[PDB]
Amino acid sequence: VLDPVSIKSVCGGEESYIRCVEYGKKKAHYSNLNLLAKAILAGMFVGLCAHASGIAGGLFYYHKLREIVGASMSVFVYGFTFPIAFMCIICTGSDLFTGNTLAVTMALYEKKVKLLDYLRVMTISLFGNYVGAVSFAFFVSYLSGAFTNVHAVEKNHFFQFLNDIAEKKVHHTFVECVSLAVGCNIFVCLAVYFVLTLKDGAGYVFSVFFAVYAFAIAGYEHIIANIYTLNIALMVNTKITVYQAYIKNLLPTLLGNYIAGAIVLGLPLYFIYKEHYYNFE
Amino acid sequence: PVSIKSVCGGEESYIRCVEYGKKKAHYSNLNLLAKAILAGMFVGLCAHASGIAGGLFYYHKLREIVGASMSVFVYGFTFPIAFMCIICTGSDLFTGNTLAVTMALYEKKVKLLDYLRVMTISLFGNYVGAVSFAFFVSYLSGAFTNVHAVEKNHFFQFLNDIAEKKVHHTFVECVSLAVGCNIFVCLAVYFVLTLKDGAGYVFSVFFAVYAFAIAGYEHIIANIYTLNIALMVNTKITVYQAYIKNLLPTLLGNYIAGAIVLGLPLYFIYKEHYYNFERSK
Amino acid sequence: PVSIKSVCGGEESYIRCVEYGKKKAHYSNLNLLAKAILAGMFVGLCAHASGIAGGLFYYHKLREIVGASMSVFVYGFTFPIAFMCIICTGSDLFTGNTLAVTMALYEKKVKLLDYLRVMTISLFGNYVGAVSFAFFVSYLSGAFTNVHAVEKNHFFQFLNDIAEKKVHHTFVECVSLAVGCNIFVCLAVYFVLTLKDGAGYVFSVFFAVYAFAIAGYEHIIANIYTLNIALMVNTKITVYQAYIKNLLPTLLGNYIAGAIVLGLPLYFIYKEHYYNFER
Amino acid sequence: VLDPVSIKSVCGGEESYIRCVEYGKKKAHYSNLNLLAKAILAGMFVGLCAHASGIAGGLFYYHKLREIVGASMSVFVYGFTFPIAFMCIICTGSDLFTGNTLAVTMALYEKKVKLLDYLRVMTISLFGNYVGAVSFAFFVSYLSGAFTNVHAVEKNHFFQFLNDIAEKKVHHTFVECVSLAVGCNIFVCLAVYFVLTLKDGAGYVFSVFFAVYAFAIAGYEHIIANIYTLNIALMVNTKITVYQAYIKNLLPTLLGNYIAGAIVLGLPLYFIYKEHYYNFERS
Amino acid sequence: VLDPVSIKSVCGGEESYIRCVEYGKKKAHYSNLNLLAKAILAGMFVGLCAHASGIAGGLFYYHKLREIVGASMSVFVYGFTFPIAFMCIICTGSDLFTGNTLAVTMALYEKKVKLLDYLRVMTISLFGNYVGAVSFAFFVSYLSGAFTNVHAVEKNHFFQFLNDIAEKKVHHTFVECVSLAVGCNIFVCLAVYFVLTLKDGAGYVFSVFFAVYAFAIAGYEHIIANIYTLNIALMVNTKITVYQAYIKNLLPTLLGNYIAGAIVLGLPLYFIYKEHYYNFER
Numbered sequence A: 001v002l003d004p005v006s007i008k009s010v011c012g013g014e015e016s017y018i019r020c021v022e023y024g025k026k027k028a029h030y031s032n033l034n035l036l037a038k039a040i041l042a043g044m045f046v047g048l049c050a051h052a053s054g055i056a057g058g059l060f061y062y063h064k065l066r067e068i069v070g071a072s073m074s075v076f077v078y079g080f081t082f083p084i085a086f087m088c089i090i091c092t093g094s095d096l097f098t099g100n101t102l103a104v105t106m107a108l109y110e111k112k113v114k115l116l117d118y119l120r121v122m123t124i125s126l127f128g129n130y131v132g133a134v135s136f137a138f139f140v141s142y143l144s145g146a147f148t149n150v151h152a153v154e155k156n157h158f159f160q161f162l163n164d165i166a167e168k169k170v171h172h173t174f175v176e177c178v179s180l181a182v183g184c185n186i187f188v189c190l191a192v193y194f195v196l197t198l199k200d201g202a203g204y205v206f207s208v209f210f211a212v213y214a215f216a217i218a219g220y221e222h223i224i225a226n227i228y229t230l231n232i233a234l235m236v237n238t239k240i241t242v243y244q245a246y247i248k249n250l251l252p253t254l255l256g257n258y259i260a261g262a263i264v265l266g267l268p269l270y271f272i273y274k275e276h277y278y279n280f281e
Numbered sequence B: 001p002v003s004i005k006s007v008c009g010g011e012e013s014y015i016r017c018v019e020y021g022k023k024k025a026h027y028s029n030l031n032l033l034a035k036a037i038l039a040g041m042f043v044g045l046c047a048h049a050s051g052i053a054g055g056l057f058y059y060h061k062l063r064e065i066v067g068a069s070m071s072v073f074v075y076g077f078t079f080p081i082a083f084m085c086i087i088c089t090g091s092d093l094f095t096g097n098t099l100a101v102t103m104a105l106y107e108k109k110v111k112l113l114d115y116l117r118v119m120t121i122s123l124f125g126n127y128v129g130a131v132s133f134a135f136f137v138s139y140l141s142g143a144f145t146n147v148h149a150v151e152k153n154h155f156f157q158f159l160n161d162i163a164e165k166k167v168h169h170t171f172v173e174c175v176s177l178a179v180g181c182n183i184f185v186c187l188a189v190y191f192v193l194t195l196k197d198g199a200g201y202v203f204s205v206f207f208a209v210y211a212f213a214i215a216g217y218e219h220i221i222a223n224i225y226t227l228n229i230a231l232m233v234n235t236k237i238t239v240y241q242a243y244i245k246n247l248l249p250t251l252l253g254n255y256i257a258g259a260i261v262l263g264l265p266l267y268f269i270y271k272e273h274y275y276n277f278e279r280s281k
Numbered sequence C: 001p002v003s004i005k006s007v008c009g010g011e012e013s014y015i016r017c018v019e020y021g022k023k024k025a026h027y028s029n030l031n032l033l034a035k036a037i038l039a040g041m042f043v044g045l046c047a048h049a050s051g052i053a054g055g056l057f058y059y060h061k062l063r064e065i066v067g068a069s070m071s072v073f074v075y076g077f078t079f080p081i082a083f084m085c086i087i088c089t090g091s092d093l094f095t096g097n098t099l100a101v102t103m104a105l106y107e108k109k110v111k112l113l114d115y116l117r118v119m120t121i122s123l124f125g126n127y128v129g130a131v132s133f134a135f136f137v138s139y140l141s142g143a144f145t146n147v148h149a150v151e152k153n154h155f156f157q158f159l160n161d162i163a164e165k166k167v168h169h170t171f172v173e174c175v176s177l178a179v180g181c182n183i184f185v186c187l188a189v190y191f192v193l194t195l196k197d198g199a200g201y202v203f204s205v206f207f208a209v210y211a212f213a214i215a216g217y218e219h220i221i222a223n224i225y226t227l228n229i230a231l232m233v234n235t236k237i238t239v240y241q242a243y244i245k246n247l248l249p250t251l252l253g254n255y256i257a258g259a260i261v262l263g264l265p266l267y268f269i270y271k272e273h274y275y276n277f278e279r
Numbered sequence D: 001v002l003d004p005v006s007i008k009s010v011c012g013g014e015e016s017y018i019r020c021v022e023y024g025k026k027k028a029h030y031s032n033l034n035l036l037a038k039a040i041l042a043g044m045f046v047g048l049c050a051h052a053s054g055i056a057g058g059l060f061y062y063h064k065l066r067e068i069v070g071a072s073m074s075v076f077v078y079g080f081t082f083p084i085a086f087m088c089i090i091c092t093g094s095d096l097f098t099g100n101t102l103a104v105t106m107a108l109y110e111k112k113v114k115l116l117d118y119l120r121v122m123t124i125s126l127f128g129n130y131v132g133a134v135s136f137a138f139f140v141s142y143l144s145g146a147f148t149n150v151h152a153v154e155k156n157h158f159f160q161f162l163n164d165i166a167e168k169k170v171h172h173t174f175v176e177c178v179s180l181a182v183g184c185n186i187f188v189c190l191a192v193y194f195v196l197t198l199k200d201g202a203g204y205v206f207s208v209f210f211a212v213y214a215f216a217i218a219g220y221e222h223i224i225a226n227i228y229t230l231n232i233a234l235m236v237n238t239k240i241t242v243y244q245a246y247i248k249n250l251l252p253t254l255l256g257n258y259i260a261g262a263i264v265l266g267l268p269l270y271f272i273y274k275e276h277y278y279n280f281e282r283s
Numbered sequence E: 001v002l003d004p005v006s007i008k009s010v011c012g013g014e015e016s017y018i019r020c021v022e023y024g025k026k027k028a029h030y031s032n033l034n035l036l037a038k039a040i041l042a043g044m045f046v047g048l049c050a051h052a053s054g055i056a057g058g059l060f061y062y063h064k065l066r067e068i069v070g071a072s073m074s075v076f077v078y079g080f081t082f083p084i085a086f087m088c089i090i091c092t093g094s095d096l097f098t099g100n101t102l103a104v105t106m107a108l109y110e111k112k113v114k115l116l117d118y119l120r121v122m123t124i125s126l127f128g129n130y131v132g133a134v135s136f137a138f139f140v141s142y143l144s145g146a147f148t149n150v151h152a153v154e155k156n157h158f159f160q161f162l163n164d165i166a167e168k169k170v171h172h173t174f175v176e177c178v179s180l181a182v183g184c185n186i187f188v189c190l191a192v193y194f195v196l197t198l199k200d201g202a203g204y205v206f207s208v209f210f211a212v213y214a215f216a217i218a219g220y221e222h223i224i225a226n227i228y229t230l231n232i233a234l235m236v237n238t239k240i241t242v243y244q245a246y247i248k249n250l251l252p253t254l255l256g257n258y259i260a261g262a263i264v265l266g267l268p269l270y271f272i273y274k275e276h277y278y279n280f281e282r
């Protein structure tokens, strides 16, 4: 007789929360240089995926097509290309600050990591991701000339795409950018939760694919992606200024993300699963 | 190799649904409220993403050729992430309860007071989460504001048109559409219990929710978010035309689909199997 | 790690099909009717969703450029979830039974009277489910009502044109198309029987269902729903055309495909393998 | 306890070679009529999937769409819907000549099958696939009237798509058709290898889908699909001749496909993995 | 009764690094002929998938369509069709130079391979991929006429797409070509890591699919794809020159792909997982 074995590749409820807490408290045990290296690699991967998505969007930001689709196909394609960043980050074992704003905050709420340790991890991850992203921007994208102003509408679709995304990201106000970053980090935290839950390749790919595509097309502000995009837009001499790039956007973006991951998502999840995490431990 | 299966039969899926509904009636009130609020917030967030994508594909010059088609298709492609954002974190939505908890009430595993308390708390929490996300994120972000310029005002136009379409049905029409919506939603809930592999977990629910959204059926929580955002953004709808015209018939149709349309036939089909299962323990 | 196999050779698939057919000849008449009606309801729901999507992509300005290609493609994209709905709820349609139960008939595991019970009840219940959904949900939804304005009439126009296409074949053509449809459905049943993984379950049947849908092959239960809702919304078709001209040929072709096209050859192939498995 | 057991579904390399050789050797012991039936069933499945792909491509061959898109969308949809023939064949346990060219040839290289049996298997598979494909082309396509000349540019796009594909397939010279068939059978045997190394259902589906879609879009010639398409085109009275169908596309396509299955892939893999196979047999 | 076994098919980070080092070491023992055959087969597969991608892009390079969408549709379709190559390489057991620039370089850093062995394997893989790709560009692509210059513009879309792609690849400078190569191979090495960490068919297909499509659409330059494309362009008499192929694109491409495989990725991951591998081997 045939007796195939019934197997579950997914979990839920308290299991995912406990795994998230464990993943968070794991990171504070690394040394400063290991954390720096991981953050640098994550920032570089984000920059690579962002460059690829920008090339695709500029491809679909073409002069004549844009007059019909009005910048719709380009954003869809950019959001279709970006998600692979999650695979790059997770498979290499590197971490991104946006995910940490949930994982390490959860670990801290349970009182696994300490406040100074949390500060160390957050600061190192942020710095590493930032310098990784800007280094990739320069060395790969800026020197490749892929985003240079050609001064000819027929060929300048990539530069125009970058300029238009930068202007969109730069002409918000404080509160609107904060809100967009909140939504961004909600999506990112949900994606990390998904991978923490769906312990299979299919889920690992597609759940975070849909999450990242949704937050990319939606227009939510991601701190690392915004750092890369704003820096490279500055490099290729778009209309955005450095004061605009940093004060207007990246400060409210970091904040929104921080709130989304720590207060909006971490605190109620902790309130829900505190007793379960205790019972497991 | 060892032969395995991640898919169970209908009897086992019915048992799993009954148990999943039963367990709902043991959480304290505050945890149920928190989980319902989280589910409502997730639905509002994914609806915001879907609406922004649809508006992007609602470009005024693209309308003239494919009017309302690409925008709706993209909205239905983007929305289904909410099912994952709910399941992977243990949150619950009223719609899936309208099947699971009533099925657990049929088999005598819940009590009437318990059932009504659970349903009321779930609905109120979902409402709070959805409206809170709508206001804060969507309306402090200016994403759907009126720009008074046809070339740029496609997000507002898409939202206004969807809101009018929703609030211009009749009672019977809306009841039928909500019935269809909840049949799809509860069928996806059944899928996530019969399929225990990540690939199925994502894709079955994706297809179900996409068919829901494209078919124009009516979902109570998504409707709450959409009409509240259409009211603060000041489209051409009215508070009465929102609540009385859509959500009351929508809620009634959703509950009918959950409890009567599918709950009773499944109960009659599988009550003997459940009784035997119980005799086995 | 550990080496795991999620598939079966095909002899095991044949044994699984025979056992699946044998199982459903044991339920009560009422349980069978309930499952058949739920299956009909599911197919009606998915047909409604796919028809609405096709109507949306039937907009007249887009239609003047792309014909009906986009509408048909999107309808085929939306339809397939019906397989998931039926399989996950434990219900059956006539089309799948044409293979599953006819196999157990050949293998002597089901008797003629029980086979006729299963077949008749499945057909009647699927009919009841389809028409009831068509009335209660589709007709009262007003989605496919004739809004004479040409620009909003795409939903009605799509259904009208599809109904005309279905009812304007000849006997032989409709029988052939139904044969193709039921061959695809039986192959999807074999797919789910063979692939015990979520990815398999979803995609193997998704592609097959979309293929038969776009190909213009005729499904008896989907045809029932479409023709009944077309009559409800007052398209150009007649009841005589709906039933005599299309439905009877469609049923005949689907049964022939499920019973003689795939049943007899697979039996002649795997009869010894099943004999030994029974040992 | 949170300790799921680690599993792997892809076990490739030497193991895939063993699986291919044993799958080729299993075909040796089946009776003649069993192989004949399996071949006929596979040919019918190919005919069905090719009919579906042709109808979809014709649907996207609308003349107004054509004058702004050419055939690109039509071929894209054709290759998007065709790939289910592989699943139809493999799930039901039938055999196709193109996929046999690798496995049965490899089992003959290892001296597991004998030359007489190998010739029997190849001949029966080819003949049965021919019968199945032509039978589906007549009894399910010609009678369905789906590909019929309507004589209206608005409605005749299915017949026009089929006619254009047929004319394209019968204007190659010997060398070009042989080359395209070589590419096609490389893709087909490679899909067979992927299915032999993937045992999840997910890869089982999508690896095959991508391989067959690439082969279809690239224009590589598949012998079985070519018989189906050319026969249905002749039945409907397209701008084509039986000479152009058989002595200008089918023979070179068969030769190229067989060479790709047996020489381009095969002997290479034999050289790579025969010592590993010998060690396996020592076990 | 109802109690499925919890299973995971994914183990990233540390385990992926260990498996990468082991995979790198496994190459340093194959015989010269075996490695050459594997590299030739991999080059042949890359040529086949590049030919299919080019044909699809040429289909979607129709002059009327191109006049509206430019080259967006053709590039997307090429990126959709190409990723199948990874599947060919992994399932056949063959090897490609670009993934070796990480795997074998890692096995060298850990000292599981020697320097002579590493250089031999790397050069053999490169030469075999060269021979396979060129033999496919001749015996399959050129001899089929699929990319012939059929002057009439209505049908001359495959040739025009190939010509424009070649002109794009040929008209960079040293630094830009090197950077785009660095990007391509970071993507290829990440796809290899995806394959090594995910041990299920779904991930196998889809992670590498997305990585390869992202690299291809992004315009990043792959040495094996570059050789195939430029050789077939030379064969079909495009506007590029014999010198412009090798001294303008393939030399910088190879350089940058090697940098990506070895220093950009290899050094940080080594500095991350060195002591953990030390632990794992004791």
Ligand SMILES: COc1ccc(C(=O)/C=C(\O)C(F)(F)C(F)(F)F)c(O)c1
Pocket (backbone or CB within 6 Å): A046, A082, A083, A084, A085, A086, A089, A090, A093, A094, A095, A096, A097, A098, A099, A100, A188, A191, A192, A208, A212, A222, A224, A225
């Ligand atoms: C290792 O576990 C993880 C995995 C992913 C992230 C993450 O945050 C990734 C992004 O934010 C992103 F930008 F790459 C994308 F949105 F694309 F996913 C993380 O922090 C930790």
Ligand SMILES: COc1ccc(C(=O)/C=C(\O)C(F)(F)C(F)(F)F)c(O)c1
Pocket (backbone or CB within 6 Å): B043, B079, B080, B082, B083, B086, B087, B091, B092, B093, B094, B095, B096, B097, B185, B188, B189, B192, B209, B219, B221, B222
């Ligand atoms: C078993 O865990 C679940 C998962 C999902 C739901 C649910 O209700 C989902 C929807 O309602 C939805 F898909 F329509 C959307 F989320 F988009 F709103 C649920 O009730 C319970």
Ligand SMILES: COc1ccc(C(=O)/C=C(\O)C(F)(F)C(F)(F)F)c(O)c1
Pocket (backbone or CB within 6 Å): C043, C079, C080, C081, C082, C083, C084, C086, C087, C088, C091, C092, C093, C094, C095, C096, C097, C185, C188, C189, C192, C209, C219
């Ligand atoms: C094993 O559980 C099942 C699942 C499906 C069927 C079936 O028959 C499917 C169709 O008929 C269909 F594909 F046409 C559609 F689903 F669209 F209705 C069945 O018989 C049994």
Ligand SMILES: COc1ccc(C(=O)/C=C(\O)C(F)(F)C(F)(F)F)c(O)c1
Pocket (backbone or CB within 6 Å): D046, D082, D083, D084, D085, D086, D087, D089, D090, D091, D093, D094, D095, D096, D097, D098, D099, D100, D188, D191, D192, D212, D222, D224
């Ligand atoms: C039983 O295991 C198999 C599986 C597949 C084939 C095969 O050959 C498949 C094709 O050739 C194909 F994909 F091109 C199409 F089906 F489309 F024709 C085979 O021979 C044997």
Ligand SMILES: COc1ccc(C(=O)/C=C(\O)C(F)(F)C(F)(F)F)c(O)c1
Pocket (backbone or CB within 6 Å): E046, E082, E083, E085, E086, E087, E089, E090, E091, E093, E094, E095, E096, E097, E098, E099, E100, E188, E191, E192, E212, E222, E224
């Ligand atoms: C056997 O394990 C592998 C599998 C694949 C590669 C590889 O490198 C493949 C490519 O580079 C490529 F050409 F297919 C693409 F550029 F698309 F990625 C490898 O090195 C080792």
